[PDB]
Amino acid sequence: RGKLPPGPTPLPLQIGIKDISKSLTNLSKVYGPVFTLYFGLKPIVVLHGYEAVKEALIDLGEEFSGRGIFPLAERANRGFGIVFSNGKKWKEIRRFSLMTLRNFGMGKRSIEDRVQEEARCLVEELRKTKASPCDPTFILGCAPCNVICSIIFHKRFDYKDQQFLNLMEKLNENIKILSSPWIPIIDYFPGTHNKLLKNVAFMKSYILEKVKEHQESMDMNNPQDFIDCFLMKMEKEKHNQPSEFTIESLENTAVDLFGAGTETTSTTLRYALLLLLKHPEVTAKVQEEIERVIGRNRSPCMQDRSHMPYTDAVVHEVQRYIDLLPTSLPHAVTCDIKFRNYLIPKGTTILISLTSVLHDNKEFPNPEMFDPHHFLDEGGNFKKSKYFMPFSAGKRICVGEALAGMELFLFLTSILQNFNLKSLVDPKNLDTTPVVNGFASVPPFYQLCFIPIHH
Ligand code: HEM
Ligand SMILES: C[C@H](C(=O)O)c1ccc(-c2ccccc2)c(F)c1
Numbered sequence: 267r268g269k270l271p272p273g274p275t276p277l278p279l280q281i282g283i284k285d286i287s288k289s290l291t292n293l294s295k296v297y298g299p300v301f302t303l304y305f306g307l308k309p310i311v312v313l314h315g316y317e318a319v320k321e322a323l324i325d326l327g328e329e330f331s332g333r334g335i336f337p338l339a340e341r342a343n344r345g346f347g348i349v350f351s352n353g354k355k356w357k358e359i360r361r362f363s364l365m366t367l368r369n370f371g372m373g374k375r376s377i378e379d380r381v382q383e384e385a386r387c388l389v390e391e392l393r394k395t396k397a398s399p400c401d402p403t404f405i406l407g408c409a410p411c412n413v414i415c416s417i418i419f420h421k422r423f424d425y426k427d428q429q430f431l432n433l434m435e436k437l438n439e440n441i442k443i444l445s446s447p448w449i450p451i452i453d454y455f456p457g458t459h460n461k462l463l464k465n466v467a468f469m470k471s472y473i474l475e476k477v478k479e480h481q482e483s484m485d486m487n488n489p490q491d492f493i494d495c496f497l498m499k500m501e502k503e504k505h506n507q508p509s510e511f512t513i514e515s516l517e518n519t520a521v522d523l524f525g526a527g528t529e530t531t532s533t534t535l536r537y538a539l540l541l542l543l544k545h546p547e548v549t550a551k552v553q554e555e556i557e558r559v560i561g562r563n564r565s566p567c568m569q570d571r572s573h574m575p576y577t578d579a580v581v582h583e584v585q586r587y588i589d590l591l592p593t594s595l596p597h598a599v600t601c602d603i604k605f606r607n608y609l610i611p612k613g614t615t616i617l618i619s620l621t622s623v624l625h626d627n628k629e630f631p632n633p634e635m636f637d638p639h640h641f642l643d644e645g646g647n648f649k650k651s652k653y654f655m656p657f658s659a660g661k662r663i664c665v666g667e668a669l670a671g672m673e674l675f676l677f678l679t680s681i682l683q684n685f686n687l688k689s690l691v692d693p694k695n696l697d698t699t700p701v702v703n704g705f706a707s708v709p710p711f712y713q714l715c716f717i718p719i720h721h
Contacts, residue, residue, distance in 0.1 A: 268602070268611040270309055273302035280447040282702035287592035287621040290314060294622070300606065303617075305450075310334075310596075311610060314619040316626055316653055322605065323618065323660030329603045331356075331661035334596030334615040337452050338459075342466045347518035348665060349526060349595070358510045359519055364665050366495045367417070373490035380416045381672045382565050384409050385680040391425055392685060392716045399690055399713040402539060407434060410531035410673055414524050417669075419476045420491040433472065433524070436465040441529045445705045452704065469524070470517040477516060492520065527666050530590060530706075531673050537709040538584040538678055541636055543689040544696050548638060549682070552577045553719075556683050562719070566679035568672060574679075575648035579641035581674050585656040587636045588700075588707050592621040594658045620655055629653040681716075688715040 274293065293301060294314040303310045313319050322330045333352050344350045348360050366372050388409045395405075405425065411434055412422045423430035443462050446454045480493045489495045496516045503509035542549045559573045560566050571578050597616040602609065610616075625633040629651055630640045643649040657664035664670065689696060690713060700707045 267609075268614075269607075269609040270302045270614070271300045271311060271608050272297055273304070273312075276304040277306075277450070278303050280449055280453065280702055282447050282700075283592045283705050284589075284700055284707060285702075286448075287589075287619065290593070290617075290619050291622060294619075300608065308615070310615045310617050311608075312617045312619065314622045316623045316629075319618055319620075319623055319655070319659065320652075322616070323597075323658070323662075326603065326605065327660045329599050329601060330597055330616060332598035332600045332613075333662070334598045334617075336596065340463070340466075342463045343514075344466070344518060344522075346512075346515045347520075347522035349522045352598075352600075355510045355515075359515065360665060362496070362499060362511075363492075363519060363523070366492055367665060367669055371489055371495040371498065372417075372492065373488070373494075375490065377417065377669060378568055378672055378676075380422075381413055381669070381676050382567065384413050384416070384422065385565060385676045387412070387422070388677055389680050389684050392681065393718070395716055397688075397715045397717045399715055401711065401713045403536060406535040406539075407438075407528070407532045409677060410535070411437070411524070411528045413669070413673060414527045416491075418473075418492045418520050418523060419480075420493075429472075433469065434528075436469055437525060437528055440465050440525065445703050447702050447704050466521060469521050473517045473520045474513070477513065492523070523666075526664075527669070531670055533706060533708060534585060534588065534590060534670075534674060535677060537588045537590075537707075538581070538674070539681075539687065539714065540696075540698055540709045540712055541584055541587070542682075543687055543712065543714055544693055544698050545636065546693055548580060549687065552580055552679075553682055553686075556679055560679070560683065562683055566676055566683060568675065570679070571675055575642070575646070576638060577675075577679065578648050579638040581671075581678060582641040582654060583636060583638045585674075586624045586630065586640060586654060588709070589621050589624050590656060590707055591658075591705065592619070592707065593705075594618045594620050595662075597662065618658065620658060623653050623655050626653050684719055685716040686719050688717050690714065 290312055291314065299313070299315045299318040301312050303312060313322050333350055333356070336350070348356065348363055351359060367377065369376055388405065391405050408425045416422045440462055443454055443458050446452065477493055480497060484494065484497050486498060486501070489498050493516065496511065500509065500511045503511050555574045555576050560570050597618060599610050599612060599614055599616060601612045627633045630653070641649055641651070657667045696712065697710055699710055701710055
């Protein structure tokens with residue numbers, strides 16, 4: 267009936283995602299690019315190497331577009347948003363969300379507009395540290411969060427506003443819980459499964475409040491944010507019950523956007539500054555390029571990227587090098603499907619090795635080294651690659667891809683346009699080793715001084 271790929275016999279201190287990825291790569295050398303692992307009677311089919319990831323996620327896109335159940339089901343019922351939903355519900359909600367994020371049905375103000383404003387605020391906030399040692403963790407967190415608040419409720423907060431601090435506190439808690447290391451089984455239980463449930467309840471409740479206020483002034487000719495756009499969809503979906511668009515669904519999708527769009531961006535920003543401190547020659551050329559293409563008066567805009575190949579290679583290289591989500595989020599096949607000499611049954615969990623693609627040693631010689639030239643051709647031009655999959659690939663590719671690319675490019679250039687980065691430790695001694703984490707490559711702690719730029 268099914269015939270899964272071969273693998274090690276069943277069941278294969280604190281172990282992180284990077285350790286797991288390393289294990290998966292070692293296993294691919296034994297069993298090949300496609301293999302099965304079992305954790306109990308639970309089989310997980312692993313895809314390793316670009317060719318197998320492409321053939322599955324891209325060439326059989328639909329069949330591999332399902333979401334893998336995960337280490338639990340969340341009776342909070344997370345399955346009504348985008349991240350953990352499946353089927354028809356996922357299909358319509360993901361589509362709606364993609365298009366709204368691409369400026370459709372959200373008013374005339376652009377997404378870039380919002381990101382440029384936050385960029386300006388991020389710079390002002392960084393000026394407030396008065397060039398004294400700073401751990402940028404918090405400030406780099408507020409920026410991405412505020413862009414999602416602006417897109418979802420049409421509101422951005424001061425980084426000192428309690429409401430805003432509360433949302434981030436809850437998000438950080440859930441993220442730290444969901445990404446705890448393993449030791450067989452996850453590692454969290456103490457008093458946690460309930461904090462996850464409660465914090466989510468709190469967040470949904472906070473959003474529902476905003477939803478209630480939007481319903482008061484809802485106007486079919488004036489949506490200006492994600493909530494208006496969603497409420498206008500429900501409107502058009504009435505007389506066609508049961509719709510996938512409901513208040514429960516709007517709040518869960520809103521919660522997904524916050525969770526998926528805050529920490530990933532924030533961690534990549536923090537990792538980028540750390541790689542910039544570590545490689546002062548790279549930073550200097552980014553600053554040179556910023557200086558000659560944009561100058562220091564006007565704010566950076568997305569059109570500048572095509573004229574700044576070194577900086578574009580640097581942003582790509584940060585994402586490629588750090589391998590933020592080594593195994594993406596788990597997938598599942600949507601029906602029984604023949605894949606090479608195998609027969610995978612509907613619902614089988616599929617684990618993708620993004621590390622195996624981002625760190626392919628033939629596409630990116632010396633893949634373990636940080637090097638902007640992994641994205642530069644032999645003439646120094648920007649070189650795009652089919653192996654650049656930090657956002658994954660296929661039908662489940664990060665719905666926030668465009669938004670995240672804008673945040674990384676605009677925030678990084680804004681920061682480098684206004685400040686020189688000064689590391690306390692001598693770069694040569696600066697340790698860039700990732701801290702153990704269950705789902706993500708996270709950078710170690712560091713501080714730096716944001717010194718108003720000078721020459
Ligand atoms: C540097 C930043 C980011 C990176 C590297 C990143 C990466 C990813 C990856 C690897 C996935 C899993 C894809 C899969 O299942 O195969 C994903 C999912 C997703 N991301 Fe992002 N992401 C980032 C930021 C964003 C932003 C800014 C948003 C907000 C709009 C966002 C929203 C989501 C959502 C909602 C999902 C789930 C999509 C689905 O299941 O269909 N992400 N992201
Ligand atoms: C807050 C919410 C939750 O279910 O707890 C939630 C929402 C989205 C993410 C998420 C994180 C990184 C990539 C894709 C999704 C997440 F880790 C947590």
